[PDB]
A paper describes a structure:
Production of metallo-β-lactamases (MBLs), which hydrolyze carbapenems, is a cause of carbapenem resistance in Enterobacteriaceae. The genes encoding MBLs, including IMP, [name], and VIM types, have become widely prevalent via bacterium-specific transferable genetic apparatuses such as plasmids. We report here that sulfamoyl heteroarylcarboxylic acids (SHCs) can competitively inhibit the globally spreading and clinically relevant MBLs (i.e., IMP-, [name]-, and VIM-type MBLs) at nanomolar to micromolar orders of magnitude. X-ray crystallographic analyses revealed the inhibition mode of SHCs against MBLs; the sulfamoyl group of SHCs coordinated to two zinc ions, and the carboxylate group coordinated to one zinc ion and bound to positively charged amino acids Lys224/Arg228 conserved in MBLs.
The modes of interaction between SFC and [name]/VIM-2 were also determined. The key aspects for binding through the sulfamoyl and carboxylate groups in [name]–SFC and VIM-2–SFC structures were quite similar to those determined for the IMP-1–SFC structure. The sulfamoyl group coordinates to Zn1 and Zn2, the carboxylate oxygen O1 coordinates to Zn2, and the other carboxylate oxygen O2 binds to Asn233 and Lys224 ([name])/Arg228 (VIM-2). Of note, there was no corresponding stabilization caused by Trp64 in the L3 loop of IMP-1, which holds SFC in the active site, in both [name]–SFC and VIM-2–SFC structures. Such structural differences in the L3 loop may cause differences in SFC affinity; the Ki values determined for inhibition of [name] and VIM-2 by SFC were 9.82 μM and 2.81 μM, respectively, which are >10-fold higher than that of IMP-1 (0.22 μM). Although the inhibitory activities of SFC differed with individual MBLs, SFC bound to MBLs via their common architectures, through Zn1, Zn2, and Asn233, and through positively charged basic residue Lys224 or Arg228 of the L10 loop.
Author numbering:
A (entry chain A): 25 to 29, 40 to 270
B (entry chain B): 40 to 270
């Protein structure tokens, strides 16, 4: 089962949406984490010609259905696919809303294999990766601007990252924490030996991205990557 | 030991008409000699190897025993994760012109683990089975990724047309008190991965593993019961 058991910001139900680029938005949803209260989780929405592509669900099915409603209102293009960046509640908790809506879903093969143990619904389709971390293109059909990179084990063994081609943006998901972070967040499923190398591999994979989007903080500069790697260095 | 054969530092045990276990040893601080096992499979007119020995020299001894005892070409080797017992001899396989295969993740981890990457990467479906285009002409070798356990990258191999499945370092002996080296292990998912190996090869009666002699299926259920205690 699951381990879980302001300017420019647009409120839409209990979610928040922020435009990051002409064709890119950040979605934000909240879940109350006993003791510490509201935990934000961010993902992305990308307009690619006549299609919308989603990175990560919200925490819940009901929140994820609200992402689809927001897309209908603000973009009014069909959602061609969603890719989720590992098998934890914040990234995959809303899979049923996507499947209910007939949306094709993608995850790391390992995320799909771990999903039952992690209390998640598996995506319909599985990404695989080359030894250099880049997605095998046959497993990323019509991903368009989404450039998927497996950096190595870090936050989880299955964590993947996504560059948005033709923009300044790369999405570190839960691997990367912001440059102000006092900790690496939830290390319950982390690989402490390989985390630092995986963070640095993400930086090297998207060497010119200037806006680093993350699950649990607002977008940051590239300093988030180096600061995260140096915090991870101390886990070894 | 009666019936076992020696070549240099290597010991070979015939498990089935076309299958041998190779065993090599390394002195580990405060542990004395640690055995590591792999497999040699005769597949008609060619030989397939599962896992290197600890070192290049030991791995060359495997290849020269194969020449002496079997006298068929070695077509390919599959190595079952990026640790020295399984991939320490990659340079000897490459020098001998043997095609090498490992989990893509093993190849990605190899530099950090001080190992040499294989020439080819295996990838796996969500159900754990190797994507067939990545494992061309593997003959009787059936490669399964059971999930993270002993390491994130550990893979397993069934030998079609035999009683044998190879758990590598994921599976420990049915009398074991411990799961051996957990330094790189996934404590949450280990038990499920061990059970997934059992379910992938449900008819295998001889379970070969890295650090103990062949056992029955009891090794799978005992490993899972030990791993349940890690959670
Ligand atoms: C801060 C935080 O809360 C949760 C619930 C997670 S995760 N993605 O590990 O579940 C994290 C994280 O660090 O990613
Ligand atoms: C007993 C043992 O010794 C070593 C050196 C290893 S491994 N494969 O983790 O390096 C193991 C193991 O448990 O696999
Ligand atoms: Zn997570
Ligand atoms: Zn997270
Ligand atoms: Zn977990
Ligand atoms: Zn090992
Ligand atoms: Zn081992
Ligand atoms: Zn290691």
């Amino acid at each position: 089962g699951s381990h879980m058991g302001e300017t420019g910001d647009q409120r839409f139900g209990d979610l928040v949406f922020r435009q990051l680029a002409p064709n890119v938005w950040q979605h934000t949803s909240y879940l109350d984490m006993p003791g510490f209260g509201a935990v934000a989780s961010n993902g992305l929405i990308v307009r690619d010609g006549g299609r919308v592509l989603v990175v990560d669900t919200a925490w819940t099915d009901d929140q994820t259905a609200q992402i689809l409603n927001w897309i209908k209102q603000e973009i009014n293009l069909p959602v061609a696919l969603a890719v989720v960046t590992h098998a934890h509640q914040d990234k995959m908790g809303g899979m049923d809303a996507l499947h209910a809506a007939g949306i094709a879903t993608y995850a790391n093969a390992l995320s799909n294999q771990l999903a039952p143990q992690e209390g998640m619904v598996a995506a319909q389709h599985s990404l695989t990766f080359a030894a250099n971390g880049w997605v095998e293109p046959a497993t990323a059909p019509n991903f368009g601007p989404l450039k998927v990179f497996y950096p190595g084990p870090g936050h989880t063994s299955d964590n993947i990252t996504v560059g948005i081609d033709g923009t300044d943006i790369a999405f570190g998901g839960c691997l990367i924490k912001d440059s102000k972070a006092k900790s690496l967040g939830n290390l319950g499923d982390a690989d402490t030996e390989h985390y630092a190398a995986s963070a640095r591999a993400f930086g090297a994979a998207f060497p010119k991205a200037s806006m680093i989007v993350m699950s649990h903080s607002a977008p940051d500069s590239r300093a988030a990557i180096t600061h995260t790697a140096r915090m991870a260095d101390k886990l070894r």
